[PDB]
Design a protein around this ligand. Structure first.
Ligand code: 7FT
Length: 209
């Protein structure tokens, strides 16, 4: 049961800009995804202060970075709050619309693509390095879903039947052929140290077998 949805025009336009503009500082994508994971961990942590049963789906709050040369993927996993089906279909796009317009309005005013996270739409920087992004997510009181898009103006949502996650989000970046440097341990360590050194949750960089 795979449902296909159209992005709103403004988000499709942003995704095309990210894919089409010449911009060499592509490494910013990782800081943006780690920042989103940190925000999601903050949210479940806060909610658990008034309802401790929200951690029944997992007490550990952490971020894992997992490279796979065999699959040509870099995966960012967190045990944060996760996303509901309504988030995937509607709420993400609703929240992003204003920031996308504002980001587009900073760019021609002279701003740089690296400021994308200040407009709340840093996730889409994943398309600087990925030809396709698959997102597996599980929110308390909702099912585990898989969202996917190769930026054709459309994305898909389906119920996920893979390894149950407990709670959180996995962003799976299917890297472009010429962006495999982001599978290298030395490269990922360099990027995390430079842009993500003061995140308040443990970040584990897995090593490839
Ligand atoms: C589907 O993939 C996307 C798309 C399409 C856009 N943005 C994000 C970034 N994003 C947004 C949320 C929660 C959120 C929901 C609704 C409205 C605003 C925020 C979120 C959480 Cl909880 N964790 C992580 N790791 N990333 C997140 C993702 C992953």
């Amino acid at each position: 049961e795979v449902e296909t949805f159209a992005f709103q025009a403004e988000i499709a336009q942003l995704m095309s800009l990210i894919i089409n503009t010449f911009y060499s500082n592509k490494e910013i994508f990782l800081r943006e995804l780690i920042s989103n994971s940190s925000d999601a961990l903050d949210k479940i942590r806060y909610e658990s202060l008034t309802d401790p049963s929200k951690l029944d789906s997992g007490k550990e709050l952490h971020i894992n970075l997992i490279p796979s040369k065999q699959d040509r993927t870099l995966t960012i996993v967190d045990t944060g709050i996760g996303m509901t089906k309504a988030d995937l279909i509607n709420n993400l796009g609703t929240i992003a619309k204003s920031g996308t317009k504002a980001f587009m309005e900073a760019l021609q005013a002279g701003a740089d693509i690296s400021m994308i996270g200040q407009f709340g739409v840093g996730f889409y920087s994943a398309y600087l390095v990925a030809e396709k992004v698959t997102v597996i997510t599980k929110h308390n009181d909702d099912e585990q879903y898989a969202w996917e898009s190769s930026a054709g103006g459309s994305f898909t949502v389906r119920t996920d039947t893979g390894e149950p996650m407990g709670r959180g989000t996995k962003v799976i970046l299917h890297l472009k052929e010429d962006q495999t440097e982001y599978l290298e341990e030395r490269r990922i360590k360099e990027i995390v140290k430079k842009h993500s050194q003061f995140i308040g949750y443990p970040i584990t960089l897995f090593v490839e077998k």
